[PDB]
Amino acid sequence: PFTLPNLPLSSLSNSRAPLPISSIGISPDNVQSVQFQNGRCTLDGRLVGTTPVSLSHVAKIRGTSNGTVINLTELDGTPFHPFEGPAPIGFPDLGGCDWHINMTQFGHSSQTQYDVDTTPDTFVPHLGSIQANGIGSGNYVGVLSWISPPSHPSGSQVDLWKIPNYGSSITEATHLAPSVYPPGFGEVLVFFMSKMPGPGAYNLPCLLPQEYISHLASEQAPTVGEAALLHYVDPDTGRNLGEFKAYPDGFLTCVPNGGPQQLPINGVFVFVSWVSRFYQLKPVG
Amino acid sequence: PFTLPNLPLSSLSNSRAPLPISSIGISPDNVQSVQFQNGRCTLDGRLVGTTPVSLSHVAKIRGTSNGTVINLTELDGTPFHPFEGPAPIGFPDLGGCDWHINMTQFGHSSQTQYDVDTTPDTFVPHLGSIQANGIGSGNYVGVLSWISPPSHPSGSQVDLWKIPNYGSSITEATHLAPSVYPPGFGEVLVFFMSKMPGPGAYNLPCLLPQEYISHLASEQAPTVGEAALLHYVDPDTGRNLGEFKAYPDGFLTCVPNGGPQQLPINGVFVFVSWVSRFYQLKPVG
């Protein structure tokens, strides 16, 4: 049976960074579609893009640095082939921002800061190589710690609704996850916002919490209708707070009234039913 | 129905630190019982000790440092009362070792290293206060990054089978999770070992993977017999690799033959059945 984790959203984690969920929100009116690569697990558990099954892989990079280039591997130590997705599994998916990664090694001391600019030509995570940017030689495992305004183009401010250019220019098939659109019908996408550390009120959006991804991947729901109508139940009282709908590509949408930013975070998404994709939602509230 | 995540162990995470699982092993012969506080979720989903439901809280501390003491809060920002367990939820559970924590802030830059000695008198996480050890004033969220040999008693080497002295001296009830023992019958406890970064081959043992904890917490299995016989199935082939048994306090035990360190990590613990606690196991192999 298809099921979503019966845990409060306050207790789950974002799927694009290892962080607690702080809000449920919608996208700014300038952003129609988003193309996140992490946090992309269809309702039948088929992980697409660079989404791992556990949070111990989310926003983590492992590889061997030559002093000039980090040859990326998978996090298990084995080599990476462009065959899987746009980058090694769990690769950070934050566009319009500079990454900052805490790097450690098995067998050594002394964690080290790794500042990553995702615009330059040498950032080609599809060819299994990112720029070292001063990280010394050796095998490293790093996790995303905090983000910053991008270095290029200077003057632009953080837009976490984009994804980094994964290289893989004209000829190759990029294995990028397909864009997800608002299913039209006066319906807007719903994003789980987690507070990212960074010089500003950074609310990182993810399409599904990570525990949701692991539950869908471990469950592998055989049956998917056109969409899955959800309610956001408040566990202390048991009153429905507003209906959402999950589309099979693994996102939730809702029609706000002016909502979803007005909903609490201590609720629980209970899978209500299987609905058609034309099914009309009641506004949030 | 009681179910364990149908994901390979290589893809799950340790419950005492945010790390991938690398092996399945047993305890040294000098260690009979272990008293881990993280990674303690009974088979009916009752989280005990300082175990959180998501990995976004495991081995994380949040609090306000006065320059001399970190007044610990819960990770959601709300104050901490000794009422829950021995320390705030998700507090690190690594005994016999010095912690090292990467600390960040919402709204600021510049991650900072926080070195924690768990022996001194001012390390009283039950009273909601640990030593600042140079961490500047302010509200911080930190995650465990790497470990080290303890500073006291000097000369002792890493023994990850202990837990830190959580303060809470003679009078108070410490809310410590009860010790878990080998149930006898020649059975020995089985530990999921993850490689911790640190100046040595640190294999951190946990009783259950974190995704197991979240699945048991979200599922809340109503029915628990005396024990749950498990098999460790290899997913590519489908051959059982050796039987374990899960006791209701949330651990697995097995009789080695000389095993469980000989088993691969790409298998999947499938809950086989409900057995009595006297049920005799076949040796690993």
Partner: antibody, heavy 133, light 112 residues
Framework: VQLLESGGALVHPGGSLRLSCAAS????????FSWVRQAPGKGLEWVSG????????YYADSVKGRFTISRDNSKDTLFLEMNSLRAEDTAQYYC???????????????????????????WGQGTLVTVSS | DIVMSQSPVSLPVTPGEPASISCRSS???????????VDWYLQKPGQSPQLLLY???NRAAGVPDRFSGSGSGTDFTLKISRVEAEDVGVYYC?????????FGQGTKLDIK
């Protein structure tokens, strides 16, 4: 992925030897391995192979019944013992790790994907076994 | 079992000019999944074999885009778009469909 092999030495025809391949830098427990050999001046020839659990071992017809492949998951080691050697087995022996693909969804998804695929991504440097008198 | 013949035994090429190494299998290497379970290995002079291509056309870790896999069914072509000096060596087409994994006699790609 580093795979270091050792044990190759001159063996009397009919003697025995034991070649070990110690692995470092990756989860050894979840990787399939294979022993391949290159005769001096000839092409590559695949000798044997072993799965992660070590219960499935495959042998070439020229060495079936005389070579034994096994693995110690604890010490991260792969083993090939050789009994009743012949001069035909004079060759350099490599331990190669078969390609792996990240989890990516489960067995409903992965049984239509080419994940077995036989291909050897990482190789060791081989140890030379000369069988002579 | 599967015998993998190759052509030619030696392929003399000039640096920069695209080279085609054919490999023909006695059995069809087209699997039901649509992938050709044929790998292309490069053993350079004095080194251990390294995987260039796997599953017909896919490139391994660190393989530049000049190596291409073409062909299907039973006959496959390693196409080197711009032969460099780093590519000299013996190219083996290994069947990966079934054990015993049989390698081809190899083509000694040499540059003019």
């Amino acid at each position: 992925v580093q795979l270091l092999e050792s044990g190759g030495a001159l063996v009397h025809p009919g003697g025995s030897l034991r070649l070990s391949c110690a692995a470092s830098g990756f989860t050894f427990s979840s990787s399939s391995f294979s022993w391949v050999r290159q005769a001096p001046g000839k092409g590559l020839e695949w000798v044997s192979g072993i799965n992660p659990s070590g219960h499935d071992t495959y042998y070439a017809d020229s060495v079936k019944g005389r070579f034994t492949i096994s693995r110690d998951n604890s010490k991260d080691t792969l083993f090939l013992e050789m009994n009743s050697l012949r001069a035909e087995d004079t060759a350099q022996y490599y331990c190669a790790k078969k390609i792996d693909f990240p989890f990516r969804g489960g067995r409903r998804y992965s049984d239509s994907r080419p994940y077995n695929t036989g291909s050897l991504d990482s190789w060791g440097q081989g140890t030379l076994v000369t069988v002579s008198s | 079992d599967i015998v993998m013949s190759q052509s030619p035994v030696s392929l003399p090429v000039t640096p920069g000019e695209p080279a085609s190494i054919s490999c023909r299998s006695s059995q069809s290497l087209l699997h039901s999944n649509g992938y050709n379970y044929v790998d292309w290995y490069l053993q350079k002079p004095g080194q251990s074999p390294q995987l260039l291509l796997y599953l017909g056309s896919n490139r391994a870790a660190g393989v530049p885009d000049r190596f291409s896999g073409s062909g299907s069914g039973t006959d496959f072509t390693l196409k080197i778009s711009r032969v460099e000096a780093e590519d000299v060596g013996v190219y083996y087409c290994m069947q990966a469909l079934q054990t015993p994994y049989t390698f081809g006699q190899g083509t000694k790609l040499d540059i003019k």
